[PDB]
């Protein structure tokens, strides 16, 4: 789309073969912009649900990290009220050798490995009451995850 090759190339490989659980796609005439859907990891507090997020490649990418954000609500010690996911590769820790598939993966490990040893309240709670937050989690997944377009 007038637009760096590395991107075009990352796109085809992702569509022509995407990832156990995850739907990604660009958006018509924002070719840097991707609508994406994680499966609830099997055996995971979010099992049921399915999670809207969005990604985008900023101009400086791959020098800069890709901006990433959940659209759906979700109890998770590293998703916050607005879905600012937080995750070293994403803030400081990013290299350009890593790529979109890499980040899609890590959000996805990220669900089933939730990391509280971080900690934010969900930070507190979620550690101090480990299956007590999973109700919350599940409930949430239940309200917000299931039956959204």
């Amino acid at each position: 789309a007038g637009l760096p090759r590395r991107i075009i190339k990352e796109t085809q490989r992702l569509l022509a073969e995407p990832v156990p659980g995850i739907k990604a796609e660009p958006d018509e005439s924002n070719a840097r912009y991707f609508h994406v859907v994680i499966a609830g990891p099997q055996d995971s507090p979010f099992e049921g649900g399915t999670f809207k997020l969005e990604l985008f490649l900023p101009e400086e990418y791959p020098m800069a990290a890709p901006k990433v954000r959940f659209m759906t609500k979700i109890y998770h010690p590293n998703v916050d009220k607005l879905g600012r996911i937080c995750l070293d590769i994403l803030k400081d820790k990013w290299s350009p050798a890593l790529q979109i598939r890499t980040v899609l993966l890590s959000i996805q490990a990220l669900l089933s490995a939730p990391n509280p040893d971080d900690p934010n309240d969900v930070a507190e709670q979620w550690k101090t009451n480990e299956a007590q937050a999973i109700e919350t989690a599940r409930a949430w997944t239940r309200l917000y995850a299931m039956n959204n377009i």
Partner: protein, 139 residues
Amino acid sequence: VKVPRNFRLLEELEEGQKGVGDGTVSWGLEDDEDMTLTRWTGMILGPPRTIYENRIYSLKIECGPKYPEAPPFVRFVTKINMNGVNSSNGVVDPRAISVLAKWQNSYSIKVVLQELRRLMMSKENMKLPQPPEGQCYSN
């Protein structure tokens, strides 16, 4: 490069927690659960050498699904007599405020919030008698 509504808003957000220190203009999500990040508060201190003299004026700003392509709605909580500030209810006329009226997708909330503060200076209004301090708009 085309930055879409959401991150572009996410920009202003975090942005708005650093500042311009230099006090004046300032801003804010009205409620952080609002993933749409639709509604926002503003906040503009007085021009000096003006009737506006350090006054805490709160605004509210709304950005609709098409911003920042389209301007956002702005309006005024704290009362003000000021050209194109409807003075029944604070709403700002965008015809009449060239930032809004001629609006650019490059613009934003610091941008508009600043431009009024230019316009408060304006000979236009540094005169203009004011409502009594910090009483204001019913709704």
